[PDB]
Every structure is written in structure tokens, then in C-alpha cells.
């Protein structure tokens, strides 16, 4: 694309500058350009990719929720049209991320940390699609999210310790999927509780810095359990 002429290292450098400037659309375009160079991404680079697109889609999700609430309260064409416009842009971003994962980040990811991170992302972006889905493919979108999360869970349980932040963030997001998308609050609670308890029992193995990383995610599990019970 438009980033094809820029050096990979320059794209990464500019992604970091865009982050500092809170220019997340730019950040995502730079990281898409970096992915399209065809090389695998390092851990730091995978995190930059995720930060960029999560912030872009986050603004779209927040706007969609505002507009959907207005639309539901109203029930001319303008509210529906504008909600649809935001929805379509949101779906486009999700399709873009899913396309990067399919071409060819996931298939080249052999190490647990990369493969789980990308499969979790695949689940997340199908989950964002599911939040707005209403048609004959809502069930299939939900199943796609579930399938990606499940593959990531299976690998994470075999290959990562229970405190690994990627494993924790995956389990957290799969629990949110169960509660918010799949009409499965009991599964959500069970997953969050077992994840929390098994992480707590493994904290003793960690350095101070890793402890901080793991307990930050554990706090989110606890917060959700408080909300859900």
C-alpha cells in the first residue's frame, strides 16, 4: 500500500512516535505497513500493532454505542444512516486486522507467545464484529471468535505458565466473550475464577517486575467477578 516505499525500521519508529502523539490511526497505518513487509513481528512490534488497532477500534466502538443508544431511544433515516456509517467503518477496521492475521501472521507464528497473541487478537476482532452483528451471520461471527479463542486457550494451557500475561489477557477476553457475546455468564465466571486462582498460585515463581505484569491482569479478572456476581 501507501507504506510500501517506507523502510520497515522507519515504519516502526514512526509507529512509536504516533503513539506518543496519540495519533492512533497513523500508528495503525504504520504498523500495517510493517506487517506487510512480510517478516515476522517481534514481541514489542506485536504489542505496537495491537495498541494501534485497539485504540482505533475503541473509538469506533464507543461512538457506535452512543449512536445505537440514540437509535434505540428513537424507536427520519439519519440516525440509522450515521450509525451504519460508523458500523461499516468499524467492520472495515476489524476486517483489516483479521486480514493481516490471516495473511500471514498466524500461519508463520510457531512460538507460543506469538501464536497465542495472534489467535487472541483474532478472537478479539471477531468479538468486536459480534458486538454489532445482527444478520444471518451473527452466529457464524460468534463461532469464529469462539474457535480462535479456543485454539489460543489450548496452546496457552500447554505452553505457558498460568501467570503469563498473554495467557491471562486471553482468558480474560474469552471470559468477556462468554459474558457479553455468548450469553454464557456461568462459563464466564468459572473461567475468570479458575484463571485467577491458578495465576495466584504461580505468582511465587516470579520476579518483582513479572509479578506486577501478572497482577495487573488478575485485578481485571477480580473486577469482572465483582461485577458479574
Amino acid at each position: 500500500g501507501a507504506m510500501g516505499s517506507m523502510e520497515r525500521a522507519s515504519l516502526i519508529q514512526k509507529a512509536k512516535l504516533a503513539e506518543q502523539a496519540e495519533r492512533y490511526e497513523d500508528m495503525a497505518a504504520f504498523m500495517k505497513g510493517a506487517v506487510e513487509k512480510g517478516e515476522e513481528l517481534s514481541c514489542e512490534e506485536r504489542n505496537l500493532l495491537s495498541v494501534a488497532y485497539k485504540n482505533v477500534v475503541g473509538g469506533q466502538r464507543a461512538a457506535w454505542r452512543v449512536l445505537s443508544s440514540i437509535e434505540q431511544k428513537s424507536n427520519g433515516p439519519e440516525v440509522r444512516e450515521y450509525r451504519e456509517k460508523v458500523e461499516t467503518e468499524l467492520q472495515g477496521v476489524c476486517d483489516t486486522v483479521l486480514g493481516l492475521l490471516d495473511s500471514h501472521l498466524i500461519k508463520e507464528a510457531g512460538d507460543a507467545e506469538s501464536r497465542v497473541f495472534y489467535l487472541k487478537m483474532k478472537g478479539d476482532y471477531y468479538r468486536y464484529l459480534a458486538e454489532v452483528a445482527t444478520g444471518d451471520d451473527k452466529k457464524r461471527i460468534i463461532d469464529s471468535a469462539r474457535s480462535a479463542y479456543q485454539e489460543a486457550m489450548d496452546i496457552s494451557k500447554k505452553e505457558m505458565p498460568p501467570t503469563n500475561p498473554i495467557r491471562l489477557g486471553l482468558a480474560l477476553n474469552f471470559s468477556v466473550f462468554h459474558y457479553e457475546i455468548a450469553n454464557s455468564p456461568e462459563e464466564a465466571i468459572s473461567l475468570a475464577k479458575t484463571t485467577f486462582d491458578e495465576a495466584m498460585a504461580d505468582l511465587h515463581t516470579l520476579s518483582e517486575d513479572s509479578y506486577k505484569d501478572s497482577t495487573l491482569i488478575m485485578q481485571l479478572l477480580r473486577d469482572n467477578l465483582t461485577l458479574w456476581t
Binding site: 514481541c43 504489542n47 495491537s50 495498541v51 488497532y53 485497539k54 485504540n55 497473541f117 487472541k120 478479539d124 500475561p165 498473554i166 491471562l168 489477557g169 486471553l170 480474560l172 477476553n173 471470559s175 468477556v176 459474558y179 457479553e180 513479572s210 505484569d213 495487573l216 491482569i217 481485571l220 473486577d223 469482572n224 461485577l227 458479574w228
Partner: peptide, 10 residues
């Protein structure tokens, strides 16, 4: 709404 993961994970 429920809390989901931060984007950056180590």
C-alpha cells in the same frame, strides 16, 4: 461493561 485486556502484554 466488562473489563477486557490491555493491548500490550509481556
Amino acid at each position: 461493561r466488562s473489563h477486557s485486556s490491555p493491548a500490550s502484554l509481556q
